[model samples]
Target: VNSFSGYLKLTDNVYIKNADIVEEAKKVKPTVVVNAANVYLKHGGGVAGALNKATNNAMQVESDDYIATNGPLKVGGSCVLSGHNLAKHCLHVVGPNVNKGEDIQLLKSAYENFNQHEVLLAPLLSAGIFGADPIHSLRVCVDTVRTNVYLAVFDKNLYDKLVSSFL
Candidate 1:
């Protein structure tokens, strides 16, 4: 953890009040940094896609001046979806669905793999009904990737200490 933090200023000037570290870091011109998880992409045709779209749209409404990175969306297989904007610099990590009980591990691995040069922006695991329950799922995701420095988008009301505790 120290090595990674040293290589990347994980806590330097992190705006814990507003959860705007990404924007803050851009100003300081830090050489390397980690970032929050913003979106989650799921496969299958049903309520899942509808919810994903709704959630994505809602998030967009919350802020317009924020930075965004997008990537491919994949389904049950490894084939990546094209022409879809999810987040800035989208990362496609392979994992099972909520029923399969693999989301936590996969998310954790993704967090662990993130380095000083990479800022992984992902959504709260299972925040979408297609995923898992918000609080429990976020806990698992946080626990697995606790060693790494990153962020998870959560409701301020639901997760009261998200910013204070992490900051």
Candidate 2:
């Protein structure tokens, strides 16, 4: 497990730990798990799929209509669903393409939901899938959120890489 003691000061109240995103985050018992999704609730791949699989497809039906009626969601929109077997709630938002500077506006749009007391947010929505700079994207994410954020550090190297990127 990755110890976040050193990085805590950097992220304010954001806590980082080496663990599973679905299994562990829920175990931490956060009020909600923000789905870093594509508005389509694409539970077939990437983060969306993992969360869906973990929830036993509970949100499948709700996500279906919410997405279909609304069309693919935009950055400034989102949906809150019952976490069911996972947690209390699932905040689904279309992740922004943090591939450019202008994306910060979209990032601002995506962060509209007010966070609960304890929450489990999705990953660095800008990185991993897209060719986004982890450090820069993480900062943008941090700037977008106003509450204490939680992250399961599945890849310790992600931290190393972010730091090394600057060096």
Candidate 3:
């Protein structure tokens, strides 16, 4: 639970949250949240990609600034960006790029490397455009984060599969 766990309550499962993710962030008020990002933060796909494109590529710009000063995104490394009009901060993590016979390990490594905050909000990851199995993704997410991890899921079927698989 890190150093200050009592401020928020952890869930028993990959629980549900409605509306847009930024809206949920507004309600939860997490000190930090997750942004499924790329190594260079090229925003054209995945969670941040689509959203950033809709919002005039703010995420890409912000992330590029971070990387320019810092370095390329590590597999498990992350950077905290101002959510701007969104949440307090965006925990931009370089999520796993799924491929043949390497997804589970990469996915697990992605979560393993995030050691900043006790709470995180991660999406279904590669299930959208990178073509990962939802059940496997959630399983990796559940097994790796090992903290107050609240998954943001929009698809009803995938959500059901996550809950049922864990059950």
Candidate 4:
């Protein structure tokens, strides 16, 4: 398994940790773990799925309760919930759908919304099924979010690219 490969400095305080989000959550134990979810906040796949799976589906139940009570979070919107097995809390945000010509500011907003956390565990939001280019999304991530950030990435190649590009 690809254990924690250490972290890349993003700013004086913000850093991106090259590691598996779920596997490392227990060790790093940030104040909040961010989920790259749909507007509906369903943890069906990608980072969402992995986080939910790590929580033994308790996160799904919490998310369902949230949506049933509050309605779907709009693009660039976010919500916080009590964390389950792996973390102390969970932050859910919907990024812009690049495939639909959505504005990048929405993605920026998503990252900004995450700054609410003191210590945040975040994925490479929107760079997967949402169609954002990896480097493009990584740039947006670094540009926004003035927090103690841990960008949990699994792919070694993408992790290397993110570090080099930032350097």
Candidate 5:
């Protein structure tokens, strides 16, 4: 197992290469996945971009939605920050914008419904939001969330800081 230390500083916004990410994720088989990289408005068009693509591809390839809603409610949209599907249970977290404190309630709601061995996977920062910084974004997320199996992923060197803080 790799030690989560000396990954990346929170202040920097690192752009991870696609090839490296795919390889690393495959190797890790991480239960929790966080995409804290800088997603452009054009490229993927932020979280919704990736989510939409994943949904569409899943539907297209298998004729069923791979991203199912395990909890009572499903969260997320074209321009919203939300989480769903607990690792071991049915818990979901969703928000509008972390920078605007829209995510605080969502985080709290998830915690209230959380169960043991639950894993919270979410992007620590708004990759394409204005006045966003990796470190600041992470700090906000960490402060609002309370979980034992919390895993935060970032782009390039940002992982260094996240690992150091959590691990």
Candidate 6:
């Protein structure tokens, strides 16, 4: 099991963990696992891809069905779907595409939009293909949330860099 190595508490209720989001989600069994998805909620790459694969593609199917019914999810918006074998539900949040002129506010909104849950397990938003710098994305995540959160960092290099930032 790729367990969480440690956590950096951002507030009384929020923390960033050095963990593989997927593996930690299984162990922690949070109320909701946030996906850093594109506007279309495509589960083909990044953390979304791993989660989709972990859930046997059920997440991808559900996302596809949702978009079919509700149209593409807008940047900074969110949708909830079953988590399959992971958490109780999956919260899909669309982050800004930096190359497309979207900015920090949109990324902040993506973190802000998740509904209240007992535990929200989230990966860094907009830090991947969306083009938001990892540090900027991590800062938005640390600054925007007010509830109990598990900020799961899957990459060791990034995790170390993030944790180092606090030291």
Which numbered prediction scores highest in TM-score against the true structure?
A: 4
Stretches > 4 Å off in candidate 2: 1-9, 98-104, 112-118, 163-167
lDDT of 5 by residue, 97-152 (tens): 45654443344333332223234334443434523455554555544444433333
Q: Give a tens-digit lDDT track for model 4, residues 1-167.
A: 22334776778656776678888887867678888888887888888898898888999999999999999998998999877877788888889878878787788888888777767778877877778887878888777877777788778888888888774
TM-score pick, better of 3 and 5: 3
Model 5 off-target regions past 4 Å?
A: 1-24, 34-44, 47-56, 59-93, 98-117, 125-133, 149-167
lDDT of 2 by residue, 1-167 (tens): 32123333336556555455777645654567777676567767656777888877877777887777877776646778887666678887665755434354565566545354344545665455645555765666567676766655457888656545532
- The 10-residue segment of model 5 with minimum total lDDT is 83-92
Better of 4 and 5 by TM-score: 4
Ranking by lDDT: 6, 4, 3, 2, 1, 5
lDDT of 1 by residue, 78-141 (tens): 2112212333232333333565554454554443433322333334443443365555544555
lDDT of each: 0.36, 0.62, 0.63, 0.80, 0.35, 0.81
TM-score of 2: 0.76
lDDT of 2 at 49: 76
lDDT of 3 by residue, 77-122 (tens): 6777876555567777765666523344577677664545666666
Which lDDT value does model 4 have at 3?
32
Model 5 quality (TM-score): 0.40
Deviating ranges (above 4 Å) for candidate 6: 1-5
lDDT for position 47 in model 2: 63
Query: What TM-score does candidate 1 reach?
Result: 0.37
How close to the true structure is residue 22 of candidate 5, measured as C-alpha lDDT? 26
Give one digit per residue, the lDDT tens place, for model 6 in 22-53.
89888877778998788888898888998999
